[PDB]
Design a protein around this ligand. Sequence first.
Ligand SMILES: Cc1cc2nc3c(=O)[nH]c(=O)nc-3n(C[C@H](O)[C@H](O)[C@H](O)COP(=O)(O)O)c2cc1C
Ligand SMILES: Cc1cc2nc3c(=O)[nH]c(=O)nc-3n(C[C@H](O)[C@H](O)[C@H](O)COP(=O)(O)O)c2cc1C
Lengths: 131, 132
Amino acid sequence: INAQLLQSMVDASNDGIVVAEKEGDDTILIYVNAAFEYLTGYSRDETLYQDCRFLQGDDRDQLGRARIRKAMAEGRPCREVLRNYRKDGSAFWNELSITPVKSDFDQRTYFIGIQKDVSRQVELERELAEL
Amino acid sequence: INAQLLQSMVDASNDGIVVAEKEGDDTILIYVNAAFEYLTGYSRDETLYQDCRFLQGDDRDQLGRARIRKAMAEGRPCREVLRNYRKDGSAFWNELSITPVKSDFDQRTYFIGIQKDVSRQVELERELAELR
Ligand SMILES: Cc1cc2nc3c(=O)[nH]c(=O)nc-3n(C[C@H](O)[C@H](O)[C@H](O)COP(=O)(O)O)c2cc1C
Ligand SMILES: Cc1cc2nc3c(=O)[nH]c(=O)nc-3n(C[C@H](O)[C@H](O)[C@H](O)COP(=O)(O)O)c2cc1C
């Protein structure tokens, strides 16, 4: 399995896949896939080198950002569900999966983020409960 | 992005990711990530070098197969929602995504599969429609 096949495996992923490096208090993105651009509504040019905190908008009082911050500082994987907002403003429920990985090229730990949209299932459970 | 990061991105994927090659009427597997092992219940040793039609079991009557065979022969991506069964026999709705790709290393057309489990979503919508 070569890097070309691996790259196309990433581009064919249903969930969004991003890679982010740490720059102090903010971890900025260095790679986004096509699934991330359609999920968030942003393009690769306007999403690189910026922390993914913009997806949270002003909904900054969530339990996930705290567990995410603690796990990354300790090199621990974590999975949290966050309420994020697209460029248009639509709110989508994101089952984010962060995995710190060690790049042997520069011996720098990078962070991989898998974004899965579960907003449709959350709306189903709420609608069935109201019935 | 180097090849080590791309491999870690595949191993961290929630959905199952596999790579298969064409061997006539069959399309045997050559790579299986950890997600495909937990989702299908079959180990890498069992699922390798065999076509993925075994997940269908006895439910081989699905119109998605003819659409899959058409897309792979015409080198076109395809997505189908099929009824597959794990090793325990528990049925699960698999949103399969096949993307034919040309490996420049050997000029052989490989096929990338993305298995997404949507079992409960189908159950929830079915429960919603019956209540409506
Ligand atoms: C690789 C990676 C991907 C991330 N993706 C998202 C995301 O899609 N949505 C989100 O709300 N936060 C995401 N985050 C988390 C934020 O970027 C940020 O690091 C986190 O909210 C830290 O909270 P803080 O603002 O208190 O420091 C991601 C983090 C990493 C490292
Ligand atoms: C990479 C790849 C992954 C596949 N994964 C599945 C799968 O998970 N479940 C399934 O029912 N069919 C899967 N298929 C389709 C079957 O392997 C097979 O091609 C299809 O069922 C047609 O079989 P047939 O020739 O007997 O009609 C996959 C095909 C490819 C190329």
